[PDB]
Scaffold this active site. Structure first.
Site, PDB file in Angstrom:
ATOM      1  N   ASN A 104       1.045  -1.331   0.047  1.00 17.51           N
ATOM      2  CA  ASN A 104      -0.039  -0.108   0.014  1.00 17.51           C
ATOM      3  C   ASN A 104       0.689   1.302   0.029  1.00 17.51           C
ATOM      4  O   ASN A 104       1.646   1.305   0.853  1.00 17.51           O
ATOM      5  CB  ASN A 104      -0.961   0.031   1.206  1.00 17.51           C
ATOM      6  CG  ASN A 104      -1.932   1.088   1.295  1.00 17.51           C
ATOM      7  OD1 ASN A 104      -2.825   1.127   0.040  1.00 17.51           O
ATOM      8  ND2 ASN A 104      -2.177   1.850   2.357  1.00 17.51           N
ATOM      9  N   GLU A 131      10.389  -4.484   4.495  1.00 17.17           N
ATOM     10  CA  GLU A 131       9.436  -3.709   5.081  1.00 17.17           C
ATOM     11  C   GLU A 131       8.156  -4.408   5.343  1.00 17.17           C
ATOM     12  O   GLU A 131       7.179  -3.970   4.669  1.00 17.17           O
ATOM     13  CB  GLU A 131       9.331  -2.338   4.535  1.00 17.17           C
ATOM     14  CG  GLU A 131      10.744  -1.391   4.580  1.00 17.17           C
ATOM     15  CD  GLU A 131      10.573  -0.449   5.935  1.00 17.17           C
ATOM     16  OE1 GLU A 131      11.685  -0.357   6.487  1.00 17.17           O
ATOM     17  OE2 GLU A 131       9.555   0.041   6.316  1.00 17.17           O
ATOM     18  N   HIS A 151      10.874   3.489   3.617  1.00 17.75           N
ATOM     19  CA  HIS A 151       9.896   2.511   3.574  1.00 17.75           C
ATOM     20  C   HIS A 151       9.770   1.896   2.077  1.00 17.75           C
ATOM     21  O   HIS A 151       9.828   0.695   1.834  1.00 17.75           O
ATOM     22  CB  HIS A 151       8.722   2.890   3.960  1.00 17.75           C
ATOM     23  CG  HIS A 151       7.625   1.704   3.999  1.00 17.75           C
ATOM     24  ND1 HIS A 151       7.286   0.797   4.528  1.00 17.75           N
ATOM     25  CD2 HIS A 151       6.475   1.683   2.829  1.00 17.75           C
ATOM     26  CE1 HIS A 151       6.347  -0.114   4.264  1.00 17.75           C
ATOM     27  NE2 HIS A 151       5.675   0.364   3.100  1.00 17.75           N
TER      28      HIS A 151
HETATM   29  O1  VK8 Z   1      -0.605  -0.552   7.463  1.00 18.50           O
HETATM   30  C1  VK8 Z   1       0.482  -0.087   7.374  1.00 18.50           C
HETATM   31  N1  VK8 Z   1       1.618  -0.896   6.983  1.00 18.50           N
HETATM   32  C2  VK8 Z   1       1.633  -2.245   6.628  1.00 18.50           C
HETATM   33  C3  VK8 Z   1       2.699  -2.917   7.690  1.00 18.50           C
HETATM   34  C4  VK8 Z   1       2.722  -2.925   9.087  1.00 18.50           C
HETATM   35  C5  VK8 Z   1       3.676  -3.468   9.880  1.00 18.50           C
HETATM   36  C6  VK8 Z   1       4.897  -3.865   8.941  1.00 18.50           C
HETATM   37  O2  VK8 Z   1       5.765  -4.684   9.838  1.00 18.50           O
HETATM   38  C7  VK8 Z   1       5.066  -3.624   7.640  1.00 18.50           C
HETATM   39  C8  VK8 Z   1       3.910  -3.144   6.980  1.00 18.50           C
HETATM   40  N2  VK8 Z   1       2.480   0.317   6.925  1.00 18.50           N
HETATM   41  C9  VK8 Z   1       2.185   1.283   7.247  1.00 18.50           C
HETATM   42  C10 VK8 Z   1       2.999   2.382   7.214  1.00 18.50           C
HETATM   43  C11 VK8 Z   1       4.302   2.718   7.053  1.00 18.50           C
HETATM   44  C12 VK8 Z   1       4.498   3.697   6.231  1.00 18.50           C
HETATM   45  C13 VK8 Z   1       4.240   3.926   4.717  1.00 18.50           C
HETATM   46  C14 VK8 Z   1       4.467   4.944   4.278  1.00 18.50           C
HETATM   47  C15 VK8 Z   1       4.744   6.125   4.677  1.00 18.50           C
HETATM   48  C16 VK8 Z   1       5.508   6.074   6.036  1.00 18.50           C
HETATM   49  C17 VK8 Z   1       5.367   4.676   6.798  1.00 18.50           C
HETATM   50  N3  VK8 Z   1       2.091   3.462   7.702  1.00 18.50           N
HETATM   51  C18 VK8 Z   1       0.899   3.569   8.019  1.00 18.50           C
HETATM   52  C19 VK8 Z   1       0.165   4.638   8.329  1.00 18.50           C
HETATM   53  C20 VK8 Z   1       0.980   5.912   8.792  1.00 18.50           C
HETATM   54  C21 VK8 Z   1       0.442   7.235   8.938  1.00 18.50           C
HETATM   55  C22 VK8 Z   1      -0.945   7.155   8.703  1.00 18.50           C
HETATM   56  O3  VK8 Z   1      -1.485   8.371   9.238  1.00 18.50           O
HETATM   57  C23 VK8 Z   1      -1.740   5.993   8.698  1.00 18.50           C
HETATM   58  C24 VK8 Z   1      -1.039   4.721   8.461  1.00 18.50           C
HETATM   59  C25 VK8 Z   1       0.254   2.401   7.837  1.00 18.50           C
HETATM   60  N4  VK8 Z   1       0.900   1.115   7.616  1.00 18.50           N
END
Ligand code: VK8
Length: 295
Positions: free
Chosen positions: A40, A131, A272
């Site tokens: 995603n 990731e 990420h």
């Molecule tokens: O479900 C998820 N996964 C799936 C996942 C879970 C555990 C794992 O070990 C691996 C993958 N990942 C995210 C991320 C991560 C990310 C995405 C892009 C840029 C910065 C950070 N960030 C969010 C989120 C961040 C702000 C926000 O306001 C709402 C949601 C959700 N994520």
């Protein structure tokens, strides 16, 4: 590489009551085969600069998850983990794969890939993950603290942030790429979601599925607990963890998987969306891992 160039390389196959788009470097061949699974809010486009280092030595496939990329949109707007898995499992059965395959996966594509592997253990040659969704989240002290962010996105504000303002595409995605994407690259990520409304629902439902214990998603929790138990004890499954430096979840994943058997680690530079900063190093690591699978 524009989106138009990438998806011109891709094929489409009917899958259940919809259709999925996918890259296939060598259709119908039972040579060494690798399947690349995005998460995603990306698509098979995420792998466009990784695959050229792997496809000289392996047939490479990269599907767009349902509702994403150039895959079909579902009229019921239901894109939970188990919905994605239903369509992806049918896709696996529709593209003439060999008996054993290697899975390369990222973000929610690793949730789907780990689960598919756990349910088809006889088909697994090896797993490359990055990731990745390697375990459930209990305390936030082990993980990056996004507790409030997940509370927010699960609230009714999430419909506004995502369906109306495309938060995951316009804010989150560039925030975890070290370089700045070209306009053409950014437009390729925008294209599946250019229409405000339910076209964007997959990018909202995915974070609402995050496997936080006591978070109301017990089906996801059981699925992740199950494949975590398997991955932690599968001495016969070769694994490659591609660690991103500084990454986002990578530091936590390194700790969580430190005792996983039959795992090697390679570190590349990135946040990420590490594929956008170190595609060559990721592709080369995968090619070398495929070589080790012959042992
Ligand atoms: O479900 C998820 N996964 C799936 C996942 C879970 C555990 C794992 O070990 C691996 C993958 N990942 C995210 C991320 C991560 C990310 C995405 C892009 C840029 C910065 C950070 N960030 C969010 C989120 C961040 C702000 C926000 O306001 C709402 C949601 C959700 N994520």
């Amino acid at each position: 590489a524009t989106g138009d160039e990438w998806w011109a390389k891709c094929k489409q196959v009917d899958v259940l009551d919809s259709e999925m788009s996918y890259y296939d470097s060598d259709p119908g061949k039972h040579k060494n085969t690798v399947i690349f699974l995005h998460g995603n809010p990306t698509s098979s486009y995420l792998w466009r600069n990784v695959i050229p280092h792997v496809e000289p030595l392996a047939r490479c496939l990269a599907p767009d998850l349902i509702g994403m990329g150039k895959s079909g949109k579902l009229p019921n707007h239901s894109y939970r983990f188990v919905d994605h898995y239903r369509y992806l499992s049918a896709w696996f059965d529709s593209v003439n794969l060999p008996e054993k395959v290697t899975i390369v996966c990222h973000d929610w594509g690793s949730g789907l890939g780990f689960h598919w592997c756990n349910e088809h253990r006889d088909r697994v040659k090896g797993i490359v993950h990055m990731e990745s969704v390697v375990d459930v989240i209990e305390s936030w002290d082990e993980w990056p603290d996004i507790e409030e962010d997940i509370a927010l996105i699960k609230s009714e504000a999430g419909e506004e942030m995502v369906l109306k303002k495309n938060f995951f595409i316009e804010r989150l995605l560039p925030s975890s790429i070290m370089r700045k994407l070209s306009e053409e690259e950014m437009d390729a990520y925008r294209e599946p979601f250019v229409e405000p409304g339910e076209s964007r629902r997959p990018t909202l439902t995915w974070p609402r599925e995050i496997p936080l214990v006591k978070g109301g998603k017990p089906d996801v929790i059981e699925i992740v607990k199950s494949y975590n138990k398997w991955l932690s004890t599968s001495k016969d499954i070769p694994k490659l963890f591609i660690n991103a430096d500084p990454g986002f979840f990578s530091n936590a994943i390194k700790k969580v998987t430190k005792n996983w058997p039959n795992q090697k680690t390679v570190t590349v530079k990135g946040l990420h969306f590490l594929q956008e900063d170190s595609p060559e190093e990721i592709g080369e690591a995968i090619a070398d891992f495929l070589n080790e699978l012959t042992k």
